[PDB]
Symmetry: C4
Subunit: 93 residues, 4 copies
């Protein structure tokens, strides 16, 4: 549960970093920057927003490599250590 | 096999939730909303439909984090506990 | 190595099925249909081609759920049982 | 740590190959070709750049199958053998 908290905070900080970057460099609204960061790191990739600048493209490359591991790490812990036990508890009437 | 049934039902409910949300908030046809929900949670992300409203964007963020774990959990069980044995059984003439 | 061969053939058959479906229902050139099938099941999802018909959308939903498991199963075996040993062998001068 | 170095170099070479291919065949700027290669192999798939030629489509199919395993292998090692210990070390004041 300390592992979950840590992954939770790391995920938030990572996404705040993306939000700051894309709003600054690609000129997105903060909400759009946050959304883009999430859709990128979860690898959903809508692409409706996609970096138009080389700085944006280079950062996105680095961001994916460093960020995917921590985002999926958090999702995996969320699924196995949080959602799994919760659904199980519901199954005992 | 009770695990498969549970993951099956959770996946259906999750997708129904997405269908309801996107048809309501983003104004998609139910079929398009369902399709969008699936393409989002499996992380395929065509993006032909992509949320235009901030409510849509914020929900999609939360939906991905909560939904990916249960959708891939179902796919993984479907693959290992259902498809794997089926193909194996076919390989004995 | 029989496991690799089986996953290889299952992957080919799965992709041929997608090729047939999308060329028929969505009217894509066979090459475009094959490409779409691959980009869908590997979850890359360019979306340049994305189903315009409801039949196309419903099939794509089912196709993803049934196909992702077998495609990633093949990729995983290709990586661990084929590429891994190959690169290792190269590392001994 | 020799495993990390090897996966690091293999990832670089794989991406250089993609950069060369897409700039040549699809006529992309090298930076755009590199970006496309990364967004493809990590399966993010923005699709803003998507192959217009059949040669491009066929290569992309083969590239995904051969490349995904080595890119995610590198990401996984980066996450578990590099990022994991680093964050842990930060947690001891
Ligand atoms: K993906
Ligand atoms: K994707
Ligand atoms: K995508
Ligand atoms: K896309």
């Amino acid at each position: 549960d300390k592992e979950f908290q840590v992954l939770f905070v790391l995920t938030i900080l990572t996404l705040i970093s993306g939000t700051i970057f894309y709003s600054t460099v690609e000129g997105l609204r903060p909400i759009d920057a946050l959304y883009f960061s999430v859709v990128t790191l979860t690898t959903v990739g809508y692409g409706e927003f996609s970096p138009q600048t080389d700085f944006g493209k280079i950062f996105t490359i680095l961001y994916i490599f460093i960020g995917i591991g921590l985002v999926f790490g958090f999702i995996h812990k969320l699924a196995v250590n949080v959602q799994l036990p919760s659904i199980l508890s519901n199954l005992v009437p």
